[PDB]
Amino acid sequence: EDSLMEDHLELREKLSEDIDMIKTSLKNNLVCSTLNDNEILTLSNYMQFFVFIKQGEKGSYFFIINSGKFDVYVNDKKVKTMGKGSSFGEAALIHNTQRSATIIAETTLWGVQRSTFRATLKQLSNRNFNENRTFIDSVSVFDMLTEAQKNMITNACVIQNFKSGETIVKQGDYGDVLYILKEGKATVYINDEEIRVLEKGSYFGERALLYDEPRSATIIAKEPTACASICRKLLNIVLGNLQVVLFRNIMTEALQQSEIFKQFSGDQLNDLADTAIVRDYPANYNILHKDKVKSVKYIIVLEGKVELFLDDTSIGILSRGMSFGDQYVLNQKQPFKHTIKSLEVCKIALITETCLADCLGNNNIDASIDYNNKKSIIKKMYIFRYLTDKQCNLLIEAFRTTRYEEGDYIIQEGEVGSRFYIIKNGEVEIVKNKKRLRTLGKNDYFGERALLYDEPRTASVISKVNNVECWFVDKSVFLQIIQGPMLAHLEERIKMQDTKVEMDELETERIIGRGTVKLVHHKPTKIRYALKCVSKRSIINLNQQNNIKLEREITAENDHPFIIRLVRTFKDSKYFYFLTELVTGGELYDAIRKLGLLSKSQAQFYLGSIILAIEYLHERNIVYRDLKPENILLDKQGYVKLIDFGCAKKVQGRAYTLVGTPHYMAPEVILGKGYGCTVDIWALGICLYEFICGPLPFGNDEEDQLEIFRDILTGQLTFPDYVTDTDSINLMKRLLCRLPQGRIGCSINGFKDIKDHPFFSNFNWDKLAGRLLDPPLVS
Numbered sequence: 021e022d023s024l025m026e027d028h029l030e031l032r033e034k035l036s037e038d039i040d041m042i043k044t045s046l047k048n049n050l051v052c053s054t055l056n057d058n059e060i061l062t063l064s065n066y067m068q069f070f071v072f073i074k075q076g077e078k079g080s081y082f083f084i085i086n087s088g089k090f091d092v093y094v095n096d097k098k099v100k101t102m103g104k105g106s107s108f109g110e111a112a113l114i115h116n117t118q119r120s121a122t123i124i125a126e127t128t129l130w131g132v133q134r135s136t137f138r139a140t141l142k143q144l145s146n147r148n149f150n151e152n153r154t155f156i157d158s159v160s161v162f163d164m165l166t167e168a169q170k171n172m173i174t175n176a177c178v179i180q181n182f183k184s185g186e187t188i189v190k191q192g193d194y195g196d197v198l199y200i201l202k203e204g205k206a207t208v209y210i211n212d213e214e215i216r217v218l219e220k221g222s223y224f225g226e227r228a229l230l231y232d233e234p235r236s237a238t239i240i241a242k243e244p245t246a247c248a249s250i251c252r253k254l255l256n257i258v259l260g261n262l263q264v265v266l267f268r269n270i271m272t273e274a275l276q277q278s279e280i281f282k283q284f285s286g287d288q289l290n291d292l293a294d295t296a297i298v299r300d301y302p303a304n305y306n307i308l309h310k311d312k313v314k315s316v317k318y319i320i321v322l323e324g325k326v327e328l329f330l331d332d333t334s335i336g337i338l339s340r341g342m343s344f345g346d347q348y349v350l351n352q353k354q355p356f357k358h359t360i361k362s363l364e365v366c367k368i369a370l371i372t373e374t375c376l377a378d379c380l381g382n383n384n385i386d387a388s389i390d391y392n393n394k395k396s397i398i399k400k401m402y403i404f405r406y407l408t409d410k411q412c413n414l415l416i417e418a419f420r421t422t423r424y425e426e427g428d429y430i431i432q433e434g435e436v437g438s439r440f441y442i443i444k445n446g447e448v449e450i451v452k453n454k455k456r457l458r459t460l461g462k463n464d465y466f467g468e469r470a471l472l473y474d475e476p477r478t479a480s481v482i483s484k485v486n487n488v489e490c491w492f493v494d495k496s497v498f499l500q501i502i503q504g505p506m507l508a509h510l511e512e513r514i515k516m517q518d519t520k521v522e523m524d525e526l527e528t529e530r531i532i533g534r535g536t537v538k539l540v541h542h543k544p545t546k547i548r549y550a551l552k553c554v555s556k557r558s559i560i561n562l563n564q565q566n567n568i569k570l571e572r573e574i575t576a577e578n579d580h581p582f583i584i585r586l587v588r589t590f591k592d593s594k595y596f597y598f599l600t601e602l603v604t605g606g607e608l609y610d611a612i613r614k615l616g617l618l619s620k621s622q623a624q625f626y627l628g629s630i631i632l633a634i635e636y637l638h639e640r641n642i643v644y645r646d647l648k649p650e651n652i653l654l655d656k657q658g659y660v661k662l663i664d665f666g667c668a669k670k671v672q673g674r675a676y677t678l679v680g681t682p683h684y685m686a687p688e689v690i691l692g693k694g695y696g697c698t699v700d701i702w703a704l705g706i707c708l709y710e711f712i713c714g715p716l717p718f719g720n721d722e723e724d725q726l727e728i729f730r731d732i733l734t735g736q737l738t739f740p741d742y743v744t745d746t747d748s749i750n751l752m753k754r755l756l757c758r759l760p761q762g763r764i765g766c767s768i769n770g771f772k773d774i775k776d777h778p779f780f781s782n783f784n785w786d787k788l789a790g791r792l793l794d795p796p797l798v799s
């Protein structure tokens with residue numbers, strides 16, 4: 021294919037003229053029409069020369085015609101002549117393409133292969149991101165940004181290049197842009213006077229991100245100069261407001277270092293930060309003084325420095341992010357004994373009694389600590405995690421205390437249990453058929469199966485020591501709080517995932533998909549499963565050895581109600597096997613077939629379901645990459661399951677490989693300058709459009725993969741005349757924002773912006789995950 025093409029090569033030193041004409045062709049090209057004159061040049065210099073071209077076979081080469089004329093016979097008969105300036109095999113730069121059609125020559129080509137093309141974009145992109153990220157770490161204003169936030173604003177960087185003698189900023193102008201010099205040298209002028217010279221790693225415009233004031237200097241490139249630039253406009257979309265995020269981060273970091281506020285939820289600490297009174301004080305100023313302090317119980321320093329005293333005795337100096345008042349937060353009726361005096365102009369966060377009660381959900385701090393440390397534990401457990409907040413709150417207040425002494429059988433192997441236990445204090449031994457399995461301690465849990473099943477306990481639980489306290493809830497209370505569908509779900513899920521299964525215990529009933537997916541019965545238990553069989557030989561032959569390892573890893577650790585649950589894997593001489601739950605509600609496509617165009621409530625249900633599944637994967641740094649209705653089943657209750665984890669990757673910085681279904685692939689995948697979890701939120705938009713409008717919004721009626729990609733890249737997004745709902749159109753437009761930086765869901769707040777969109781105003785996210793909503797369709 022390409023082997024033939026290499027014969028035609030010749031080493032031709034590109035003159036000034038040639039680095040011009042190649043620049044034109046690529047600038048007027050689907051994939052290259054948004055690359056800097058720096059990247060177009062780097063690509064331009066990688067172009068091989070060819071003396072002398074294609075047929076109908078697999079091809080990797082993109083050509084820019086130099087010298088002669090080239091006839092393009094489309095169906096084995098002349099279609100059109102092409103001459104100096106023209107290009108062809110555009111598709112080759114995207115993906116391994118079945119060629120457009122044969123192209124003989126009449127009477128020089130510039131050339132490059134896909135592998136070399138994608139690799140150059142990759143190396144350029146990674147190099148540029150890593151440089152910008154290191155530079156952002158040298159800008160002190162961004163110090164209190166989280167790692168995640170720093171990576172987000174790195175994407176916001178725009179490269180700018182400046183000819184010698186070209187103004188970067190003018191004194192008096194109202195710029196909202198910060199510049200970091202990547203290469204070259206600028207002169208700083210103030211009132212037309214030469215002050216100093218900026219160099220590589222220099223930066224200015226910090227104030228321009230925070231205030232709306234005029235430039236204090238004119239800065240002019242002395243030699244050719246490249247800058248990284250952040251605009252306040254883009255920073256605001258990505259972060260919301262820089263100063264607010266910095267002060268919130270300072271406060272939440274401090275609360276996470278406190279031995280009192282440590283043990284509280286991430287939501288509660290964000291409430292405290294967001295609700296805290298923030299005040300400026302002058303220098304050498306008494307802020308808090310002994311008896312004369314009222315409702316203030318805790319302070320965090322945001323700026324400057326204060327000195328803590330107890331009567332006359334200096335205890336220490338608090339600077340940024342340091343805090344005081346644990347004993348006052350614990351004992352809010354005890355008198356304030358300490359003094360706090362500013363050592364300089366400072367900014368302090370004050371947390372009051374009212375702020376503590378409003379955020380920690382109780383007048384009584386020790387009740388709040390007790391509530392949360394019970395909540396933390398069950399919230400990490402599958403069976404409690406997806407209960408509504410009402411159901412959760414009922415379960416937590418149902419917990420009572422009991423005590424045990426060294427050697428006491430808390431549970432006895434063989435007995436019918438009714439109780440779930442959490443360890444308040446002490447250590448217990450778990451013993452199954454006389455063999456110690458493990459020791460459990462403070463905050464560990466046991467016995468949960470008694471909630472779902474009337475069965476013999478499988479192990480004893482024996483108190484290891486005296487003075488052992490457990491919280492307990494009886495199943496009668498759990499069974500009152502829970503409702504039919506969720507209980508059926510848990511009873512079905514836990515039984516089938518914990519059954520020990522051997523290959524000899526399985527028989528096949530029918531083939532489901534075709535390697536092959538079989539419907540299998542476990543003979544001893546009569547439980548049904550799906551079994552995916554992948555050919556060992558087929559995997560070795562497609563160098564997919566590393567990829568199947570990574571599929572098992574991802575499929576294994578998935579534990580979400582709206583994602584397929586793996587039971588275990590098998591292997592023999594010929595196959596790898598996946599044993600999963602059997603999903604029996606058919607395909608999502610069966611549902612939209614029967615239903616037609618979805619109403620707002622049916623669309624809310626299916627998109628919202630998918631959003632919760634995708635949010636779960638992103639939280640564990642997985643990008644799904646193949647989101648489409650085809651890849652979603654329904655269970656017997658009408659709730660969804662994501663099934664196909666072939667395209668899924670753990671995210672190690674930036675991904676670059678082209679994977680997925682062309683109609684659903686995000687522009688940033690196609691353009692090859694790198695992508696992350698964002699691509700799944702683009703696909704979310706393609707899915708919603710299908711749901712409401714009916715057809716796909718891009719390349720709906722196109723056979724040619726290339727014309728699909730063009731429509732995704734440049735096509736006008738329109739709606740049919742029967743789609744008028746402002747909130748539906750707005751959510752779809754924002755999801756199909758081509759630039760991932762300004763796409764909805766893709767900023768600091770993540771999926772919160774999608775969940776809180778007006779499209780979902782009447783939509784109960786708790787009731788969805790809790791299986792309390794009526795689905796669009798059942799069975």
Ligand SMILES: O=C(c1nccs1)N1CC[C@@H](Nc2nccc(-n3cc(C4CC4)nc3-c3ccccc3)n2)C1
Pocket residue numbers: 532533534537539550551552584598599600601602603604605606607653663664
């Ligand atoms: O609705 C039904 C049925 N109704 C009554 C009896 S069976 N089915 C829908 C598809 C089948 N259920 C199912 N459950 C889980 C996974 C799979 N499944 C299907 C596919 C097709 C090939 C793409 N792939 C899987 C699968 C199975 C195991 C691991 C990974 C994926 N199928 C049966």
